[PDB]
Structure 1
Amino acid sequence: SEQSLNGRWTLKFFPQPAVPVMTIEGAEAANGIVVDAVVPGNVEIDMEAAGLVEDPMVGNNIYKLRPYEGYQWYYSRTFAAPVVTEGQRLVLHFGGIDTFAEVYVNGIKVGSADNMLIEHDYDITSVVKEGENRLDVIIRSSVMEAQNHFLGTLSIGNFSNEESAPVRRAPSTYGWDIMPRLVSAGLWRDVTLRVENPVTIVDANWVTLSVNPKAREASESLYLQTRLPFEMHDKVKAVITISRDGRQILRKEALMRKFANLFTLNLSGVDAWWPRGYGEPALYTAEVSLVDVTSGKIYDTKTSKIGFRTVKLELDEQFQFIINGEPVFAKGTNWVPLDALHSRDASHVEEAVQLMVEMNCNIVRCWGGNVYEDTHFFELCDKYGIMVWQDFAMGCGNYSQRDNFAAALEKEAISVVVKLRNHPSLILWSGNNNDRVSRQVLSRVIYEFDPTRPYLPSSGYYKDPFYTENPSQFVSEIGYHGCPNRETLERMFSPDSVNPWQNGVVGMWNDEWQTKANRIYDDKFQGGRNDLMTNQVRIIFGEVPADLDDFIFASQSVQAEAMKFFVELWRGRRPYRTGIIWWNIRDGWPLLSDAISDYWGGKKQAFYYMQNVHHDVCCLINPAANGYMLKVDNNTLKDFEGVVEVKDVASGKQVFKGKFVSKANQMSEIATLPMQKGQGMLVISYRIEGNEYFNHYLYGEPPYKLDQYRKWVKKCGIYELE
């Protein structure tokens, strides 16, 4: 059984002195404040519930959490230890400790945590009592831990904070241009008590050796590691079961004559796992149990949903992902922190993944500035067919080449790889970077613990040749600023600061708008990152509107047209272009950013534009001095037939009407359209297998008139001005 230690804990906080508190008698003796804390949680959530801090999402209140970065946090609770039989093991499991802390059980230290991003398991079998036991965790300041290290030259001056270089925490917690500075602390993931038998499963590594999708065959390997007392050798059998919706497909039983074994399962009548568009995300329940051959008692059982899929990164001799022997075109978003207070991430995962399902992304890149997402995130990507590109947790910056950092990074890499290597959605590991970390440490971990996935050591006007003539087949990062919806503006800003213009002077941002750009520290300055919004609006629409609703529509339209153009340009230049990962789909804080949706679920206009150019089959138009090139792109393994009609919005004249055949996994040209005069919009209507789809193309050259573009969008009949 598994007993949960989540719930109400006791939290005592106080400023950290020159000598950090490491013991219990020191934590109880320190003059501090005591509050009721919820675990999993962040300490700022507990303090806001106590009325001690104000909502950091509103105004400049984010800077008011500054003093608590030098505090210590004393967690303490009491649990009932279950009765253990002789030979069993009692494990205390922490899913998330932020970050540097000493763990005590019954006044005895059981471990010292030093990594925010990985789990920490402790054996407390010999230190527990009978009845109620006391658990104590004394966390110290993450910021002050940086001064225990001497930084290398290239670790200073990067965009990532110097405080983030020598420690193993999410880099964006120290502040970024898309995430606030909120280091925080606390037990931000589950804390559980586990009772393990003498015979228990240490790890079950499922690996697809081969997959024959057209034959509905697959060869799956199970690298099983167990704890097996020698008196249990030749007396325990491993029971392997592959099932789908309850129906049993294969059952293999084998006697456990050694603690580690490889079982190869040659399956038939099983479907392959495919990313979105290229097929179904077929998942099968894989269960392994350790059963006594005499009494039949089950000692342990591991269950998960696995997918039969092969992954190969073909480096062009600038790459292309090969899934099940087929070259897929990757279209997706970068994944940023779901929340600055990362204990709330698990409450956003389901709804945020749905943003990618609605977008019809087939790939997602987990940004190295974020924590590693939990298992439930990958379980969702498994069943929705979203491939996962995982960067290791290092941000814009170079890191130490010494042995201490390598050992800490090796311990972290092995932990996260073992935790995630069995998800079919996971397809790539990246160093996000001569470097020991990217070309030796991380590559050596992938070499030993996951040889079946590739490892990569490193990663104005939207029609400007900088974007157009970029020779990369696979773009990994690309984004344009977009002002959030009015409702999100009124919620995060003070009433007198909702309008951005200080004194009404167009272009000069007030202090609260400068905070939500994002200004990491509270320095009073004018301009900076927010000027990107007015600059991009001034280019496309000539002048920056003074009215807020006009400025919202203008800024969201610039982001919408720019983002839609990049996707249509990459999908339209196949088969040379092999993939596009844009930045980004969702904000992790109430902020002014280049994401296409906010922290509160407010979808910007770019989200609807991007959604209509991410379909499995998409009719689009690419620019040409000869006029318009009507194309259709197919990101599936099937051919589709439809009828497409293009008419001019301002005149109502029909420019083209005819049927098309979209060949599988390729771009097909439909027709070349006559060049229209001046500026305007073409509406693209096409029907495929009884379903209506819609797209558009804005012709002409900037500067455009804002009021004219708005009429064209409303008459196009696709997007609401809202």
Structure 2
Amino acid sequence: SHMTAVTLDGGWRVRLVPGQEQGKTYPKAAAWLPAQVPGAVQTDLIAAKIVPDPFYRDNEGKIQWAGLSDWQYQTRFTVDAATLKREHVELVFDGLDTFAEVTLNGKQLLSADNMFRQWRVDAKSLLKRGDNLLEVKLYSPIKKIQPWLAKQPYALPGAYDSAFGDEPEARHSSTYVRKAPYNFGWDWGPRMVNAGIWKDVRVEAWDAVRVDGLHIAQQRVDAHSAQVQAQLDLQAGRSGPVQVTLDVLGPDGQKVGQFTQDAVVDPGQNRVDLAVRIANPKRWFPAGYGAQDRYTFVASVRDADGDSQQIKRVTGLRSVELRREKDRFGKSMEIVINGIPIFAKGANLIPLDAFPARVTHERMRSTLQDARDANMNMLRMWGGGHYQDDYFYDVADELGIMIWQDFMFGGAVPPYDVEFRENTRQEAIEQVKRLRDHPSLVLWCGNNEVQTGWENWGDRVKFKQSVDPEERTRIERGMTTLFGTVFREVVATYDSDVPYWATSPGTDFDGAADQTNDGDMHYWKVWGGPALPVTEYLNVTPRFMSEYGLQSFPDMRTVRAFAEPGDMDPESPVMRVHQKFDKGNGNKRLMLYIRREFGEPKDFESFVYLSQLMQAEGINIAASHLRASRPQSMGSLYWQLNDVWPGASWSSVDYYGRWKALHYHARRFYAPEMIAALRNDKGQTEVSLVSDRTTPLTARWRMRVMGMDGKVLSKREEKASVNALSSQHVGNFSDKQLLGSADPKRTYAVFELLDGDTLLSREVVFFAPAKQLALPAAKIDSQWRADGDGYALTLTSDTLAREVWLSFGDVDATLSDNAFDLLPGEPLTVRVTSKAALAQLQSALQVRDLAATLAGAPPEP
């Protein structure tokens, strides 16, 4: 009979395992309370109003006890006679976080110890007709591991200390458990050591054959043909004939062809492979390089009892090559898609929430749409988080956002015992199997920063030199095996047509990590470490930059969402709670960078804005430099894209999906055709024309040197033929070739790139820190007009207006552009999209600019 699958998302309740100190302290949690599946006991507590929202003000501490406690889930469910007559009946847990003991009708069913693994167990023996009682006990990873850890000769160098002191310093349990690293707190997120059934639970029943998977293995793909192999993986309880039918539909939906294969399956696993050749394929390309065409593979399996079953895969035909060849700059690192070398433009992706089980499809999609809108073509799913929901990868496929997929290791030195290795191997197999058919997934990576940490971080270096050399060898061997062998083999076996990368940053264990002439780099000498000036970005040029960034505050709307009017000061206890860099004392670093460029902010609202400008302009410099240095560099992924929480971070989009100034800048410096004018610390401005086109660009570029009084000092226009997929230097100007005798504090330069009379890109360059400039007081005129859905807002400034920031108080609105420069007498129109009426928008409109913000600023302390 038809394979049946019933989800158990009803009647769940949860309570503290009896006998714990937390039970006495929180008696409401000692009693049964409603529970959501999927969910977390933390959010169950919040929903039952037992604890306040941990995101709000300084409530974070008030929920910490939950992650130190043991929890007991319970649900009852009924199984009908047809289901119990079936030859196979199983319970499936897609996600247990993390140390779980499951009982069914009072006897043992399952032991689970990996947040990222699927657990299938034969339940038929233990099930009864009518009412069944399913219980799931979850144990605090901290409470379970710490007693063991305290007796060990050493604790492995881990991640972050507990700000609440419930784990010893430098003795982190997080290292020893397969659980999302960021749960234990990070320098942009709260400590939420979640416990929960955080994925679906199912009762599944089948008779002759269970279809366990379909994988469209791409053997070779080019313009002329695609040769693939549909691989059906079939679990059979008894030997017998099956017949497989395969329909292939193209991007439009028409049948591409039909294929059939008879086979005899035997008890256990069986693979039935069907070869498919697609002439002149409509291939899948990343964003900006074509369409995101996808084919649909539909397999039908009829078993020995005449029962038919369907399984579908929506996949994209594409070749992927990680090209590493020797050249002038050492050894390249290029993502090549369909024979096209793609300069990776994007950012690092972290979880969308501190509580991942409640993340909506809406937010998953808008996060990717954000990336697409800022002209990105790649996101790196950073290894300190969790593997995303299926739907996330679906939208990624659809939008053409390539995914650099870390396995979920975030920097901690892993233990080298076999059991941890084999536990992790099975995790890798299941995730690779689940995600491999997504065309957007173009690279697997073993971890984030483990090697570079081992080699470059003070604590790692001291540790590895403190232990006996033979113990050091055991530890290093464990890492090399896990990240060099185990993960590589899983990918080579199950997702063979995409490359693997031992560690980010690194050279795939060829040599040392974080090199400038081989592999990728995480550059944090700006912001972190010595905290060098942002112009130092111009002196660093790796073959691929996979991390770098600057911090900023979220939107004013987001600030008011977690803070009250009395809290509006970066040094307030509430703002410090929401600043997680450098043990809560992050503002000092943030203020270092703000003051450098803009001096001392007049008020809290100016502080937030200036913090965002600091971040935006700093990253603008680096990204433009990287792109302009092609083919020396071939990748820019800034830290970070998104937030898990309302608070200060390196994101360009905050927790509520609100664009910072950086994200608006990102669209520009990631634009397919871009002009880069970068003035370094020697007073030299290098101008480059960047084109990601696969065709030549017949361009013109202008250069105008302006007094801040409106007078033009010089005007220049030149022709340029930019090659496809390239960067061309068109000029290099000293300060004195530009200003001559003119005062650098009172002069600026405008750079424009054109195609015919269409302005493709523009950059405004200054010759002194903004705080020293004599910026003009701008009179900005604004006109409104309905335009389709929302409104067209036209801004016109009489003078130069730097970094114009539009906002509307608590009236929600999106803009097609923001944080832009207005040039004298040149009107700019931006699309306002809002549920609000025009009159409301007009009344609520606020127009901020750099000159007005700096005006009246107090001195630096």
1:571 deviates by 0.7
Give me the whole-angstrom Cα distance separating, in 2, the residues matched to 1:569 and 1:90.
Answer: 59
The 5 A counterparts of 1:627-646 are: 628-641=685-698, 644-646=701-703
For 1:404, the equivalent position in structure 2 comes to 419
Give me the whole-angstrom Cα distance separating, in 2, the residues matched to 1:15 and 1:407.
Answer: 33
1:244 aligns with 2:243: no
For 2:462, the equivalent position in structure 1 comes to none
Give me the whole-angstrom Cα distance separating, in 2, the residues matched to 1:373 and 1:351.
Answer: 14
Which of 234, 238, 263 aligns to 2:274? It is 263
Kept in 1, the 8 Å contact 2:213–2:234? The answer is: yes
1:34 deviates by 1.3
Which of 578, 588, 597 aligns to 2:653? It is 597
Give the counterpart letter for 2:644 in structure 1.
G
Kept in 2, the 8 Å contact 1:336–1:586? The answer is: yes
Assess, with a 3 A threshold, how the Cα gap between structure 1 residues 639 and 282 changes in structure 2: closer, same or farther.
farther
1:273 deviates by 1.2
Assess, with a 3 A threshold, how the Cα gap between structure 1 residues 114 and 362 changes in structure 2: closer, same or farther.
same
For 1:25, the equivalent position in structure 2 comes to none
Assess, with a 3 A threshold, how the Cα gap between structure 1 residues 227 and 242 changes in structure 2: closer, same or farther.
farther
For 2:180, the equivalent position in structure 1 comes to 170
For 2:335, the equivalent position in structure 1 comes to 321
Give the counterpart letter for 1:99 in structure 2.
T
Kept in 1, the 8 Å contact 2:352–2:644? The answer is: yes
1:472 deviates by 1.2
Kept in 1, the 8 Å contact 2:41–2:195? The answer is: yes
The 5 A counterparts of 1:494-509 are: 494-500=564-570, 509=571
Give me the whole-angstrom Cα distance separating, in 2, the residues matched to 1:252 and 1:652.
Answer: 73
Kept in 2, the 8 Å contact 1:613–1:695? The answer is: no
1:307 deviates by 0.9
Assess, with a 3 A threshold, how the Cα gap between structure 1 residues 87 and 152 changes in structure 2: closer, same or farther.
farther
1:644 deviates by 4.7
For 2:502, the equivalent position in structure 1 comes to 457
For 2:576, the equivalent position in structure 1 comes to 514
Give me the whole-angstrom Cα distance separating, in 1, the residues matched to 2:135 and 2:278.
Answer: 49
Q: Secondary structure of the residue that 1:352 maps to in structure 2?
A: helix
Q: Secondary structure of the residue that 1:126 maps to in structure 2?
A: helix
Assess, with a 3 A threshold, how the Cα gap between structure 1 residues 114 and 706 changes in structure 2: closer, same or farther.
farther
Which of 217, 227, 235 aligns to 1:227? It is 235
Kept in 2, the 8 Å contact 1:99–1:116? The answer is: yes
1:392 deviates by 1.3
Give me the whole-angstrom Cα distance separating, in 2, the residues matched to 1:65 and 1:118.
Answer: 26
Q: Which is worse superposed, 468-477 or 190-199?
A: 190-199
1:562 deviates by 0.3
Higher relative contact order (CA 8 A, sep 6+): 1
Q: Which is worse superposed, 302-311 or 490-499?
A: 490-499
Kept in 2, the 8 Å contact 1:360–1:614? The answer is: yes
Give me the whole-angstrom Cα distance separating, in 2, the residues matched to 1:293 and 1:557.
Answer: 67
Assess, with a 3 A threshold, how the Cα gap between structure 1 residues 628 and 239 changes in structure 2: closer, same or farther.
same
Assess, with a 3 A threshold, how the Cα gap between structure 1 residues 467 and 622 changes in structure 2: closer, same or farther.
closer
Kept in 1, the 8 Å contact 2:752–2:759? The answer is: yes
Give the counterpart letter for 2:483 in structure 1.
S
Give me the whole-angstrom Cα distance separating, in 2, the residues matched to 1:383 and 1:462.
Answer: 40
Give me the whole-angstrom Cα distance separating, in 1, the residues matched to 2:534 and 2:375.
Answer: 27
Give the counterpart letter for 1:570 in structure 2.
L
Give me the whole-angstrom Cα distance separating, in 2, the residues matched to 1:350 and 1:393.
Answer: 22
Q: Secondary structure of the residue that 2:220 maps to in structure 1?
A: strand
1:305 aligns with 2:305: no
Q: Which is worse superposed, 36-45 or 442-451?
A: 442-451
Identical pairs, percent: 25
1:365 deviates by 0.8
For 2:133, the equivalent position in structure 1 comes to 134
Kept in 2, the 8 Å contact 1:238–1:256? The answer is: no
The 5 A counterparts of 1:662-677 are: 662-669=722-729, 675-676=738-739, 677=742
Structure 2: where are the runs of 5+ without partners?
162-170, 326-330, 451-476, 505-525, 777-799, 805-821, 831-846, 850-861
1:535 deviates by 0.1
1:370 aligns with 2:440: no
1:198 aligns with 2:288: no
Give the counterpart letter for 1:665 in structure 2.
L
Could you say what the CA RMSD is over the residues aligned between the two structures, in angstroms? 3.1
The 5 A counterparts of 1:378-417 are: 378-417=393-432
Give the counterpart letter for 1:224 in structure 2.
L
For 1:505, the equivalent position in structure 2 comes to none
Q: Secondary structure of the residue that 1:209 maps to in structure 2?
A: strand
Give me the whole-angstrom Cα distance separating, in 1, the residues matched to 2:678 and 2:204.
Answer: 58
Which of 574, 579, 587 aligns to 2:635? It is 579
Residue correspondences, number: 695
Q: Which is worse superposed, 29-38 or 70-79?
A: 29-38
Q: Secondary structure of the residue that 2:576 maps to in structure 1?
A: helix
Give me the whole-angstrom Cα distance separating, in 2, the residues matched to 1:627 and 1:468.
Answer: 11
Give me the whole-angstrom Cα distance separating, in 1, the residues matched to 2:379 and 2:351.
Answer: 13
1:443 deviates by 2.6
1:287 aligns with 2:290: no
Deviations 1:522-555 (A, max 9, x none): xxxxx732211110012112x2224112222221
TM-score (norm 1): 0.89
Q: Secondary structure of the residue that 2:352 maps to in structure 1?
A: coil
For 2:14, the equivalent position in structure 1 comes to 11
Give me the whole-angstrom Cα distance separating, in 1, the residues matched to 2:318 and 2:299.
Answer: 20
1:272 aligns with 2:283: yes
Kept in 2, the 8 Å contact 1:681–1:712? The answer is: no
1:623 deviates by 3.1
TM-score (norm 2): 0.75
1:189 deviates by 2.1
Assess, with a 3 A threshold, how the Cα gap between structure 1 residues 571 and 721 changes in structure 2: closer, same or farther.
farther
1:545 aligns with 2:598: no
1:373 deviates by 0.8
Kept in 2, the 8 Å contact 1:628–1:675? The answer is: no
1:407 deviates by 1.6
1:136 deviates by 1.7
Assess, with a 3 A threshold, how the Cα gap between structure 1 residues 477 and 549 changes in structure 2: closer, same or farther.
same
Give me the whole-angstrom Cα distance separating, in 2, the residues matched to 1:587 and 1:272.
Answer: 33
Assess, with a 3 A threshold, how the Cα gap between structure 1 residues 283 and 659 changes in structure 2: closer, same or farther.
farther
Deviations 1:198-235 (A, max 9, x none): 2232222222111122x3x21112232212455422x4
Deviations 1:24-78 (A, max 9, x none): xxxxx99922111222222222222222111111111001112222222222222
Give me the whole-angstrom Cα distance separating, in 2, the residues matched to 1:645 and 1:15.
Answer: 74
Give me the whole-angstrom Cα distance separating, in 2, the residues matched to 1:681 and 1:207.
Answer: 56
Kept in 2, the 8 Å contact 1:518–1:592? The answer is: yes
Deviations 1:285-321 (A, max 9, x none): 11112125995x41x2221211111212122435111
For 1:342, the equivalent position in structure 2 comes to 356
1:474 deviates by 0.4
Which of 712, 715, 720 aligns to 2:802? It is 712
Deviations 1:109-140 (A, max 9, x none): 32112111232223323332223322221112
Give me the whole-angstrom Cα distance separating, in 1, the residues matched to 2:13 and 2:774.
Answer: 58
Give me the whole-angstrom Cα distance separating, in 1, the residues matched to 2:711 and 2:139.
Answer: 68
Assess, with a 3 A threshold, how the Cα gap between structure 1 residues 275 and 152 changes in structure 2: closer, same or farther.
farther
Give me the whole-angstrom Cα distance separating, in 2, the residues matched to 1:31 and 1:278.
Answer: 54
Give me the whole-angstrom Cα distance separating, in 1, the residues matched to 2:303 and 2:158.
Answer: 60
Assess, with a 3 A threshold, how the Cα gap between structure 1 residues 194 and 697 changes in structure 2: closer, same or farther.
farther
